[PDB]
Amino acid sequence: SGFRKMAFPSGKVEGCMVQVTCGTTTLNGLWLDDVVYCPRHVICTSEDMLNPNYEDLLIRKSNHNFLVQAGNVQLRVIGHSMQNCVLKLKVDTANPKTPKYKFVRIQPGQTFSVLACYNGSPSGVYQCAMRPNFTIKGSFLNGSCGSVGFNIDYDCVSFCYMHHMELPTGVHAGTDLEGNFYGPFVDRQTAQAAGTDTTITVNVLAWLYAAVINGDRWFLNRFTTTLNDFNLVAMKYNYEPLTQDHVDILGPLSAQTGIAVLDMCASLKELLQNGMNGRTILGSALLEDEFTPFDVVRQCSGVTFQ
Amino acid sequence: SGFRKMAFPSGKVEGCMVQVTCGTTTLNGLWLDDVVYCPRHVICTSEDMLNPNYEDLLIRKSNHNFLVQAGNVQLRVIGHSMQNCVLKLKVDTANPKTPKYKFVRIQPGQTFSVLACYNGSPSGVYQCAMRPNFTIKGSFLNGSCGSVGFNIDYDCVSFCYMHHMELPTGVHAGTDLEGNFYGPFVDRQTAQAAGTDTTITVNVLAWLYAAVINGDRWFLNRFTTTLNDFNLVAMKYNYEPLTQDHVDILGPLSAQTGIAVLDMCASLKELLQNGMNGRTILGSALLEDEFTPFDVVRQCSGVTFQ
Ligand SMILES: CC(C)NC(=O)c1ccc(C#Cc2ccncc2)cn1
Numbered sequence: 001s002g003f004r005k006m007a008f009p010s011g012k013v014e015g016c017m018v019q020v021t022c023g024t025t026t027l028n029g030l031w032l033d034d035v036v037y038c039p040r041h042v043i044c045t046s047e048d049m050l051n052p053n054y055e056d057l058l059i060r061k062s063n064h065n066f067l068v069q070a071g072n073v074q075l076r077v078i079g080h081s082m083q084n085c086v087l088k089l090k091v092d093t094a095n096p097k098t099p100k101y102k103f104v105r106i107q108p109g110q111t112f113s114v115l116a117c118y119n120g121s122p123s124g125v126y127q128c129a130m131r132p133n134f135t136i137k138g139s140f141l142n143g144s145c146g147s148v149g150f151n152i153d154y155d156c157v158s159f160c161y162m163h164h165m166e167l168p169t170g171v172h173a174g175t176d177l178e179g180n181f182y183g184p185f186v187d188r189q190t191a192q193a194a195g196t197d198t199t200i201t202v203n204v205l206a207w208l209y210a211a212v213i214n215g216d217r218w219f220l221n222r223f224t225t226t227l228n229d230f231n232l233v234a235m236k237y238n239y240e241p242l243t244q245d246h247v248d249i250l251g252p253l254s255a256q257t258g259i260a261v262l263d264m265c266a267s268l269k270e271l272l273q274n275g276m277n278g279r280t281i282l283g284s285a286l287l288e289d290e291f292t293p294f295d296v297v298r299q300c301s302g303v304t305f306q
Numbered sequence: 307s308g309f310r311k312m313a314f315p316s317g318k319v320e321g322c323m324v325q326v327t328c329g330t331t332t333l334n335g336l337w338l339d340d341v342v343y344c345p346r347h348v349i350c351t352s353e354d355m356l357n358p359n360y361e362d363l364l365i366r367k368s369n370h371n372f373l374v375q376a377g378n379v380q381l382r383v384i385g386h387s388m389q390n391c392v393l394k395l396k397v398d399t400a401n402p403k404t405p406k407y408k409f410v411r412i413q414p415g416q417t418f419s420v421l422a423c424y425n426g427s428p429s430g431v432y433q434c435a436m437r438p439n440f441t442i443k444g445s446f447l448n449g450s451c452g453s454v455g456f457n458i459d460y461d462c463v464s465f466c467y468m469h470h471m472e473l474p475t476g477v478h479a480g481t482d483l484e485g486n487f488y489g490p491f492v493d494r495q496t497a498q499a500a501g502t503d504t505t506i507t508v509n510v511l512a513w514l515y516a517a518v519i520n521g522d523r524w525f526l527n528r529f530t531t532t533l534n535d536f537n538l539v540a541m542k543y544n545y546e547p548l549t550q551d552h553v554d555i556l557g558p559l560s561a562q563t564g565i566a567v568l569d570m571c572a573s574l575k576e577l578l579q580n581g582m583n584g585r586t587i588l589g590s591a592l593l594e595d596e597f598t599p600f601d602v603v604r605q606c607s608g609v610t611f612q
């Protein structure tokens with residue numbers, strides 16, 4: 001029993017982390033096969049970040065300008081190219097620790113594990129969610145750019161996030177491994193503000209199912225509701241609209257616990273209108289929305305990865 | 307910026323996890339050098355756990371009774387012995403992935419990263435704290451026993467916890483890697499209840515310093531207090547007494563932020579007496595006490611591990 005914010009095992013990703021240095025800028029890169037992926041702002045200085053022209057800046061860069069280091073061994077760069085907002089540094093040595101992997105662009109609401117790095121060395125691992133406004137609430141300091149977010153299913157590492165920027169409000173923005181930013185953010189130090197931080201309704205419901213599975217049932221009520229009526233309350237409290245797809249996705253949890261999805265919605269409705277009354281749910285005094293129905297099932301069933 | 311519950315990189319520990327099977331019982335073991343460590347209740351059935359005599363049960367066990375498996379390769383056991391509540395299965399092959407490591411018995415209030423496993427395969431990683439009542443609030447299901455808690459400093463893995471039991475209240479109990487239980491718990495399915503779950507005061511203060519560092523300052527007040535007067539309030543709310551040692555340990559954070567430790571105590575006092583008033587601190591609606599002063603400094607400074 002017990003429910004905890006749980007990241008995937010990071011061993012497979014640790015072995016792909018390298019340090020990329022371009023001039024006076026150092027950040028982390030992802031070494032898969034014979035290619036190193038890193039944020040393209042590695043080629044920028046601090047003054048360049050206000051208004052960079054990346055195509056022009058890259059003209060002054062050759063293969064030997066990109067210093068790639070793994071441990072105390074230095075990778076030979078035999079080619080480089082810019083794809084959207086990442087650079088692909090072709091090296092001459094295939095990473096012997098390349099795991100089975102994919103590049104996946106996640107949707108808002110999905111979760112992933114972040115391996116925060118500095119100078120190509122791992123610092124820690126934590127669980128994140130792509131917010132509806134396409135930011136993430138991470139823990140990143142100077143030099144963390146290049147750190148990746150990922151998921152693991154059995155033996156395949158699905159890379160979905162690369163860290164790029166920290167917005168003036170403290171939240172974080174990045175790209176997929178193809179260099180396309182999540183949301184409307186650019187790799188420029190300009191005025192770009194995050195939108196409304198809506199709550200992932202389907203994830204709160206999955207987390208409430210996990211609470212029931214683990215003994216916390218005080219929040220269960222005697223009411224039910226309809227998707228439309230509940231969504232009227234969700235709008236008021238800045239909750240993402242619940243769709244029939246979300247209901248179907250919660251089916252497995254509904255069956256295991258015997259609590260209809262709309263019954264749980266009515267319980268959530270009361271919590272949004274009346275609060276927690278100083279109580280807690282799975283050790284939290286607020287409604288957690290960074291557990292997917294997939295995460296709850298996986299943690300509550302003991303899925304492993306080899 | 308941003309502060310997140312952060313576990314150490316688990317790659318070094320993943321490579322030491324094996325599966326130990328004894329009869330019909332399977333659990334995880336820690337393979338360091340040519341020795342495998344696992345909970346001694348692996349030799350027990352479900353009916354044996356009510357009142358086991360481990361010395362007698364082990365007489366019916368030989369080396370070949372202990373099935374140790376790493377991946378799809380099976381370790382040859384050439385010796386076995388019982389140390390407190392763990393078994394040491396001497397194998398004939400030194401783990402080629404043995405990291406630099408130590409066995410450390412942590413004190414209540416200290417934190418560590420847990421690598422939850424099942425059948426010797428990692429499932430996830432999360433951060434835990436040894437509670438003052440010597441339990442931990444983890445996420446463990448059947449077959450997780452053997453999963454270890456650890457810390458990492460640069461290249462040395464300090465193993466401090468091995469999972470053993472889940473108490474009827476949902477919290478978890480285990481031993482150090484020498485087989486001595488934390489607290490008064492035994493590896494018996496008997497009536498043993500956890501004590502008062504006191505709050506780790508020094509950790510709440512470190513977490514409040516981390517909030518200030520990251521922009522959350524609404525809780526800062528105009529008052530100060532003395533260690534004695536604050537402890538009068540700490541007793542009321544079941545908070546561990548704050549000692550001069552705790553003050554000295556918070557020194558580095560006090561210097562970086564310019565907020566005297568006793569000033570922060572007075573701010574905590576108001577929070578305990580008046581609550582949060584529906585506000586949040588670093589995304590939490592309650593006072594977090596599973597960050598040590600050491601964790602805050604490490605995450606806020608970007609310490610890495612190689
Ligand atoms: C205008 C001038 C003063 N610029 C600076 O000095 C400057 C700009 C940006 C950053 C940064 C960063 C970061 C990125 C991702 N995650 C965490 C942190 C540091 N320093």
Ligand SMILES: CC(C)NC(=O)c1ccc(C#Cc2ccncc2)cn1
Binds near residue numbers: 449451
């Ligand atoms: C009396 C009889 C019904 N016993 C059982 O079936 C029985 C006892 C104990 C467990 C367990 C466990 C566990 C340990 C550590 N972490 C998580 C879970 C499962 N099953």
Ligand SMILES: [Cl-]
Binds near residue numbers: 286590
């Ligand atoms: Cl909370």
